């Protein structure tokens with residue numbers, strides 16, 4: 057074959073790349089980590105360095121406090137036996153308080169409290185990480201698209217675990233921490249709400265999730281396809297259109313009749329993704345708060 | 359009903375959003391032209407956006423799209439039909455003229471700079487502390503064309519410093535001069551580098567670089583274009599294998 | 600009408616079939632032999648659907664549904680109103696999708712680009728051909744395929760999944776899902792990263808790729824790079840689909856019971872198989 061440029065043929069290495077400074081507090085950056093020749097065939101071999109200020113410490117620590125609130129429960133559920141822990145790992149589940157305790161924090165560690173503790177810790181972990189996604193942009197002088205994009209994910213998560221259960225009167229309505237239990241939660245949610253295939257927002261959510269696979273396949277294929285003309289260098293192609301931008305645009309124009317610009321594809325990209333969890337979040341928030349049965353709703357709303 | 363307000367609003371927004379998205383993607387190559395280069399009649403329902411201005415780094419001006427669109431270079435083609443929609447035949451050598459898959463855009467005649475104002479791409483001899491780190495090192499390997507003839511020898515890899523990757527092989531020719539072959543159009547093999555796009559005799563033809571330790575964006579486009587066109591325009595001399 | 604930069608590219612050449620016979624465009628669209636193949640197949644595909652519509656008795660796109668043949672028919676042909684049309688509309692669809700791919704290869708050839716797009720698309724065609732050919736052939740009837748309707752196809756998806764309990768427990772399908780979600784994460788991030796560079800804080804100059812890496816290395820300790828990420832999206836999204844195809848090709852053929860029960864293999868490995876305590880002892 058011609059090279060397909062999925063893996064590289066020759067790897068080069070030079071001095072460790074410590075990064076642009078702009079306004080970043082370098083006191084809070086780490087040193088380079090190892091380089092991985094293996095990663096090198098596909099992407100960059102360099103690991104690190106990592107910026108880790110006071111908000112990162114808060115986020116990771118809080119993040120671990122989560123993964124060990126659950127863990128403790130799981131080991132406990134295994135009766136401390138590692139053989140059982142490993143065997144039943146996917147069956148263990150930290151479950152939220154019963155419906156009888158409503159929105160109260162008054163519920164016993166063994167039957168809800170540990171769930172609330174883990175939820176507290178996760179809420180601190182994610183939000184703190186959010187601030188990070190902003191501040192790291194800020195310190196470099198860059199746009200806030202990442203933070204705004206992330207907020208879309210955060211939305212769906214917030215609806216599932218915090219907003220919807222609050223608007224329904226009980227923590228019991230939230231998802232449990234557990235591999236199989238959360239899949240069972242998901243299924244029984246749809247069953248209880250009339251089959252979520254009847255929820256128009258769920259429908260859109262699917263259109264965008266699939267569409268994200270469609271778009272990134274198109275886009276990634278397209279850049280790889282024009283990489284013999286410098287395609288991946290998208291920012292300098294934005295500032296100074298090259299034959300790579302033009303051949304990419306014209307492939308698509310001649311195939312489907314219309315086309316992107318080199319900055320513009322990334323606006324289709326950011327939105328196709330972001331609209332998955334945006335629509336989905338709306339879908340769920342309405343479920344059981346405004347609409348009990350989406351089949352039934354469907355019958356009376358086209 | 360709130361679900362109905364929600365869904366109906368959303369479709370409105372998605373409409374507006376698609377509108378926005380589509381106009382943002384008309385920032386380049388519009389307005390549409392007829393084949394003679396004049397402004398076309400039917401443009402489409404979407405207007406050209408209000409223009410935006412990029413501030414380029416490193417003192418390199420700005421770019422303000424959409425704007426007055428021009429190839430800024432002459433196009434050696436001629437109609438083959440008496441009406442719209444047919445191919446335009448090269449009037450000379452498409453490869454030497456830069457047309458079709460040999461096309462190049464008239465980008466700036468300076469090199470892409472990295473985040474510290476330094477040429478993004480340098481020959482590896484000039485890029486301090488860069489070396490081949492895995493894979494077969496091609497420096498020294500002979501270069502072979504699709505006519506199964508020796509075109510040259512590889513004499514250096516030209517690397518992207520900030521991205522630490524190979525971007526070209528610099529290849530020395532029968533007469534001592536060198537040429538950049540885009541790395542994506544070569545096959546490094548145990549005992550040779552094989553270039554399939556070009557035959558041995560078309561290598562001299564590759565656009566050269568005014569300065570031996572840098573490539574400008576213009577020259578990149580010319581070389582990349584030249585090499586790609588070979589696929590089409592050198593297929594007579596392309597032996598099967 | 601043509602893009603401001605387009606004519607130079609509209610040279611003759613690159614067809615796979617018919618030489619110059621169909622080497623022209625209509626408006627922005629390249630025709631070519633495979634344009635004509637596609638038009639032919641879509642056209643007849645659509646007529647035959649309107650034909651199925653007439654005989655169901657409806658013209659509403661939310662009601663029109665071309666159903667495959669009753670399982671009775673096995674892998675044979677059924678008559679037109681009772682299974683055939685779906686059979687022939689599937690011959691048109693695959694014709695049309697495969698022709699579209701080969702048209703994309705002609706466009707690539709004219710444009711001197713790589714063939715990544717059409718190869719990628721091929722994966723989507725295969726997922727489709729798993730649901731309507733490989734899976735129905737291996738099971739033994741055209742009936743196991745999904746029917747062409749906006750809602751009726753979703754009816755089939757639910758039915759089919761529930762036949763195996765909660766389909767979540769299909770392990771190929773867990774891998775599939777994780778790829779779709781990660782892909783969507785990767786798109787979000789890539790979109791956002793380039794745009795944050797193109798579109799920096801007010802008054803500030805465009806950023807550089809070094810800023811994109813520095814961003815991500817600051818955030819998560821790694822940067823895959825600008826070639827990397829395009830390799831990544833392509834890999835994630837094509838992986839998502841390949842596992843989608845796999846998770847169905849195995850279902851109802853090599854595994855046909857409740858997927859939840861499949862996981863007993865792990866629960867019963869002989870070392871922990873009988874240790875008391877836990878969920879399963």
Ligand code: BCL
Pocket residue numbers: 213216231235238239242767772773774776777778780781784
């Ligand atoms: C969306 C509707 C349902 C739901 C339905 C489903 C279904 C259906 C499925 C999943 C599946 C998954 N779900 Mg779920 N899921 C929901 C909500 C969630 C939430 C959440 C917090 O809201 C989480 C965290 C998960 C988590 C997961 C994963 C367990 C699994 C694959 C996820 C994935 O692709 O991630 C994105 C991919 C990533 C790579 C991000 C993760 C990266 C991590 C955090 C980084 C690793 C760093 C490493 C440790 C560094 C160490 C360095 C030091 C030096 C030591 N689900 C909601 C409630 N989910 C699938 C599964 O296979 O389950 C078994 C599946 O089939």
Ligand code: BCL
Pocket residue numbers: 178181182209210212213216241242243245246251252253257258261262263265332333335336337338339340756780783
């Ligand atoms: C039988 C089951 C029901 C059903 C029940 C549900 C329910 C319930 C939900 C979905 C939702 C979705 N379903 Mg559904 N779904 C069904 C059938 C399908 C089918 C199909 C082929 O049949 C498909 C393709 C989908 C697809 C989808 C998605 C479009 C959507 C989730 C988007 C997403 O990215 O979430 C993933 C993204 C997140 C969860 C955001 C997470 C962000 C946070 C901040 C990350 C935390 C990181 C953590 C701290 C670290 C990681 C740790 C490790 C991974 C453990 N469904 C059937 C009808 N589905 C969701 C939705 O939007 O509905 C409207 C939802 O709530």
Ligand code: BCL
Pocket residue numbers: 242243696723724725726727729730755756757758759760761765766767772775776779840842843844845846847
């Ligand atoms: C109750 C129902 C069951 C269930 C039962 C099933 C069944 C059954 C199936 C899936 C399949 C899938 N499910 Mg499951 N699944 C469930 C829950 C979920 C959840 C969730 C969040 O709970 C998620 C995220 C998913 C995710 C998924 C995906 C991995 C996969 C669908 C994508 C795919 O196959 O694309 C592949 C893409 C295609 C087939 C698209 C083909 C496009 C072709 C090539 C071109 C057509 C062009 C067109 C005609 C052009 C029109 C004209 C133009 C517009 C001009 N499932 C629930 C529990 N799921 C499917 C699968 O894996 O199939 C292989 C499948 O069959």
Ligand SMILES: CC[C@H]1c2cc3[nH]c4c(c3C)C(=O)[C@H](C(=O)OC)c4c3nc(cc4[nH]c(cc(n2)[C@@H]1C)c(C(C)=O)c4C)[C@@H](C)[C@@H]3CCC(=O)OC/C=C(\C)CCC[C@H](C)CCC[C@H](C)CCCC(C)C
Pocket residue numbers: 115116117118119120181182183185186189202203205206207208209329330331332333780781783784787788791818819
């Ligand atoms: C359009 C919506 C899509 C989306 C978007 C999205 N997600 C995002 C973003 C965006 C735009 C981010 O910016 C953010 C990000 O940073 O990505 C790199 C994020 C993110 N999306 C994530 C996950 C995620 N996203 C998902 C989904 C989606 N995200 C959607 C498809 C999903 C699912 C369920 O499908 C998951 C699981 C995270 C990778 C990241 C947010 C990270 C976060 O909030 O972290 C807080 C948690 C922790 C700090 C705990 C982790 C700690 C580790 C175990 C390391 C420990 C280090 C320690 C020093 C060592 C300890 C060893 C011993 C001493 C004990």
Ligand SMILES: CC[C@H]1c2cc3[nH]c4c(c3C)C(=O)[C@H](C(=O)OC)c4c3nc(cc4[nH]c(cc(n2)[C@@H]1C)c(C(C)=O)c4C)[C@@H](C)[C@@H]3CCC(=O)OC/C=C(\C)CCC[C@H](C)CCC[C@H](C)CCCC(C)C
Pocket residue numbers: 266267269270273274277311312637640641642643644645688691692695696699703716717719720721722723747748749750752836837840
């Ligand atoms: C492999 C990864 C992903 C992917 C990739 C992908 N798709 C692609 C490409 C690529 C790389 C293209 O180049 C090509 C394109 O042109 O994109 C703009 C394409 C394409 N992906 C498309 C759709 C599509 N992709 C999907 C999915 C995916 N595509 C994956 C997630 C899905 C779904 C369900 O998720 C759909 C609907 C088309 C927009 C386009 C292919 C267009 C095409 O082949 O057109 C020729 C045929 C016609 C115009 C008419 C066909 C009419 C038939 C004769 C009758 C209809 C039969 C049909 C089966 C009935 C459907 C009923 C439904 C209610 C279920």
Ligand SMILES: CCCCCCCCCCCC[N+](C)(C)[O-]
Pocket residue numbers: 063064065094095097098493834
């Ligand atoms: C898909 C994620 C990739 C991570 C690991 C990649 C390893 C592949 C290496 C293959 C290329 C090696 N070689 C010598 C054949 O070029």
Ligand SMILES: CCCCCCCCCCCC[N+](C)(C)[O-]
Pocket residue numbers: 126127175213216217218230231232233234235238
């Ligand atoms: C009600 C809170 C909802 C947030 C989503 C929680 C679901 C995540 C389940 C992941 C599995 C947990 N664990 C420990 C097994 O990894």
Ligand SMILES: CCCCCCCCCCCC[N+](C)(C)[O-]
Pocket residue numbers: 255256257259260263267324327328
């Ligand atoms: C930003 C890209 C735009 C993507 C196009 C989305 C098309 C929507 C498909 C409609 C299905 C939804 N519904 C309500 C019928 O369930």
Ligand SMILES: CCCCCCCCCCCC[N+](C)(C)[O-]
Pocket residue numbers: 312313314400401402403626627
């Ligand atoms: C799902 C529908 C997508 C179809 C998009 C096709 C757009 C092609 C437009 C070609 C006509 C040119 N125009 C508008 C200037 O007349």
Ligand SMILES: CCCCCCCCCCCC[N+](C)(C)[O-]
Pocket residue numbers: 313314315376380401402403404
């Ligand atoms: C998410 C679905 C995609 C919808 C596509 C809508 C864009 C059509 C743009 C056609 C006009 C462009 N044109 C012909 C002037 O070049």
Ligand SMILES: [Fe+3]
Pocket residue numbers: 275279290322789793829
């Ligand atoms: Fe890109």
Ligand SMILES: [K+]
Pocket residue numbers: 482483484485486487488489
């Ligand atoms: K050196």
